[PDB]
Amino acid sequence: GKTPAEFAKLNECPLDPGGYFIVKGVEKVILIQEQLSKNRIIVEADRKGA
Amino acid sequence: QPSLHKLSIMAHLARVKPHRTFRFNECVCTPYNADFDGDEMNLHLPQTEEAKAEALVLMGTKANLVTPRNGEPLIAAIQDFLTGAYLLTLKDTFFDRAKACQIIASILVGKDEKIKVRLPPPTILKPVTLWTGKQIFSVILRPSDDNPVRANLRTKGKQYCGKGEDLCANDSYVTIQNSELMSGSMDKGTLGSGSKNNIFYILLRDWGQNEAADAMSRLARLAPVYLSNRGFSIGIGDVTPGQGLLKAKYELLNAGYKKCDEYIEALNTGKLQQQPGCTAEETLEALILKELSVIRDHAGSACLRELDKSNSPLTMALCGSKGSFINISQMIACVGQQAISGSRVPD
């Protein structure tokens, strides 16, 4: 909720996306993990073709 | 760094130069599979006299012009050394005495600095004194009167019609008699790395490894100078579809789409002759694929027919330096059926 004139007091860039942490001075992003949907009936072939 | 065969590591004579990169003649790009796009290469300095000799005699580039596999040359001409040579040896090229000398004088550097240059007799005499560009090319194969090389080659070019027997309309039959180019332009199949019938290979066996290496060096000097001063460029005009193709495509596409619909109708409601060994659906795919692929083939021929000579894309396909008639037809006329694992796009 800051204005671009008040980002300048904080030494931050209005265009900087955020969405990341600062932990011990390094910027770290939690990446989006792709997963399978739990609670769903998979119907698939075994190795042996059953 | 990745070595798939023995020619990926070779021994070279060092020469010290100021700039930071490693540099070598682009004829040796094909053995290393190098492409100058920020590529890195390794260098090793053998610390022993016995290791110099084994490197020089066994691993030298002049001793390794041919791959061990099928015995075909890998150090040969590449892009802008095939295109410049092709455009030089075309029948339309004529040079006066001032420009003949200024192309030939490029070779007079290094160990050729002491030779007398042997400007050949002109072809045309009375109206004007002209040198045909094939003669300038022959100075590569024999640059001085004391040079013993007498190369001989006789082979079919890339765009040979099959009936000319040195009188073809495409000027695509090569004769090199006593190191003089009597007919035919120089393509990939004659100056390049693809296969035999390559002048460099013929010299290698006939006149030894050193004579073959010298020619490759001489062409590399001569080809850039001709192209740099003639000019080759590609522009949106070159790839722009002409009116003839624009009409033809509409007709071909409409006809093809209609035929496909009929075949679709039969499978949906009726009898489609099931091709041997296949289900009806499989058959429909085959019939549809042929009609589409036939439309693509028809739309491609039309574009090539109207593309004017001097279209740069066409030249590079004919001489084989880069690209093919598929690529031209694909960016001008029609991109093909997109196929994943050899079939139409799965659901």
Binding site: - | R15, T21, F22, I75
Partner: protein, 58 residues
């Protein structure tokens, strides 16, 4: 990384260098341009004898 492959079958070597490559058609096919910064480092042990004594002095 085991002794058989990492330290025996393939091993790191000295008197070696690496750089970006770039074209030069004015060199012969048997030649390679080496930069001065690599050439001042990569040395070859020349044994002194009657043919090279006055050359190695310079």
């Amino acid at each position: 990384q085991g002794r058989f492959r990492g330290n025996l079958s393939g091993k790191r070597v000295d008197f070696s260098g690496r750089t970006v490559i770039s074209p030069d058609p004015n060199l012969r096919i048997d030649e390679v341009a080496v930069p001065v910064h690599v050439a001042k480092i990569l040395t070859f042990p020349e044994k002194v004898n009657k043919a090279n004594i006055n050359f190695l002095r310079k």
